[PDB]
Design brief:
- The structure is a homotrimer.
- Chain A is low in regular secondary structure and about 25 residues long.
- Chain A has no helix or strand.
- Chains A and B meet through loops of A and loops of B.
- Chain C: It is found in: Secreted, Extracellular space, Extracellular matrix, Basement membrane.
- Chain C: This is 120 kDa linear IgA disease antigen.
- The PDB classes it as structural protein.
Chain lengths: ~25, ~25, ~25
């Protein structure tokens, strides 16, 4: 008889930090 | 016979929110 | 024998864009 299913895969790597925000409002 | 492949892993965790933007344009 | 491990998940979503900067100078 075939063996049991393999272990579930590894969780993926964490996502990249977001881009910096836009410039602020004018002075 | 080796068993069926394991299930795919979970997608990774989302990235952190990005840093704040630069100061706005001068008056 | 146990089957092969599953494939890894893909990379997580990129983070959201950061907040607006501070108001500009006088």
């Amino acid at each position: 008889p075939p063996g049991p299913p393999g272990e579930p895969g590894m969780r993926g790597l964490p996502g990249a930090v977001g881009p910096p925000g836009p410039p602020g409002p004018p002075g």
